[PDB]
Ligand binder design. Structure first.
Ligand code: HEC
Length: 104
């Protein structure tokens, strides 16, 4: 994906509930720094639902592509409010941005 396009999607659709920078605060949702290669429910100090703590997948490009299409279908019982991104390319652009931003 295209990182600049991703950054725009992040600002518009995610930044209202999430930070990405190292040591960024938890907001409504967890700070996402270090997500890639991590199991569900491991942002330090955030209080997750049982649903997301116990989903038991590792985050990465493929699992984010599925989750972001429809979060509640992927993690029934999640408290994240987000319908989903239908378009494959927009999911790829957002994921490429996150892969950069959450590891910088
Ligand atoms: C925009 C498309 C995004 C992206 C990329 C993510 N979200 Fe959220 N998020 C919110 C809350 C309250 C949670 C906790 C859920 C729970 O405990 O049930 C989440 C969780 C996530 C994750 C999982 C993180 C993990 O460590 O397992 C991921 C990858 C994630 N989000 C990405 C809250 C919100 C919002 C509040 C209205 C909105 C909007 C979004 N999230 C949007 C996004």
């Amino acid at each position: 994906g295209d990182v600049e396009k991703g950054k725009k999607i992040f600002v518009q659709k995610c930044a209202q509930c999430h930070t990405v920078e190292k040591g960024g605060k938890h907001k409504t949702g967890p700070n996402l720094h270090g997500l890639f290669g991590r199991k569900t429910g491991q942002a330090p100090g955030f209080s997750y639902t049982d649903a997301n703590k116990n989903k038991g997948i590792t985050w990465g490009e493929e699992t984010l592509m599925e989750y972001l299409e429809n979060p509640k279908k992927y993690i029934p019982g999640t408290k994240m409010i987000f319908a989903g991104i239908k378009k494959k390319g927009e999911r790829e652009d957002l994921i490429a941005y996150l892969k950069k931003a959450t590891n910088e």
